[PDB]
């Protein structure tokens, strides 16, 4: 039953300047059936298939260099080394303002206790976290 299948959708906190902290947005509708947000990470409560996804927005006023490397990744940690599940790399520069989105999505086999994270490499360029478009979610199929 879909009611029993866990779900989690967290969104970046905009007031946490300089980093990418996840917050549940007081989601009392997302019937998390075990999934928890601990240490900025999602912990899987059950073994099975899960849809893991995440999106980040980057923003910059002008190009200082030409080697602006923005990356977004999703990792898994089981027995307390992290393993990358999904990753992406963008380079917007070759003061004109710019933006670059990075969405990640995939289906993976998880076991109970896994700890999923979604990390970036330039939290300074993170922006638009108040529109709900910077997110990180889990759906048990």
């Amino acid at each position: 039953t879909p009611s029993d299948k866990p779900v989690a959708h967290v969104v970046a906190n905009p007031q946490a300047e300089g980093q990418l902290q996840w917050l549940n947005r007081r989601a009392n509708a997302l019937l998390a059936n075990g999934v928890e947000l601990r240490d900025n990470q999602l912990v899987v409560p059950s073994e099975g298939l899960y849809l893991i996804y995440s999106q980040v927005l980057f923003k910059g006023q002008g190009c200082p260099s030409t080697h602006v490397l923005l990356t977004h990744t999703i990792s898994r940690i089981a027995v307390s080394t992290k393993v990358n599940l999904l990753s992406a790399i963008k380079s917007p520069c070759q003061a004109k303002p710019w933006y670059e989105p990075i969405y990640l999505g995939g289906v993976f086999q998880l076991e109970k206790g896994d700890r999923l994270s979604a990390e970036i490499n330039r939290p300074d360029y993170l922006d638009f976290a108040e529109s709900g478009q910077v997110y990180f979610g889990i759906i048990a199929l």
């Binding site: 299948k5 947005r25 509708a29 997302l30 849809l51 969405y103 709900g132 478009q133 997110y135 759906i139």
Partner: peptide
């Protein structure tokens, strides 16, 4: 396309558990 859709979905405050699933796997349709 998918990206902006999941985001929008995540913000709808009058969406049930059942409904949020449906529209995520909707976006992913």
């Amino acid at each position: 396309x998918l990206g902006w859709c999941i985001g929008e979905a995540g913000t709808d405050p009058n969406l049930n558990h059942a409904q949020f699933r449906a529209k995520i796997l909707x976006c992913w349709x």
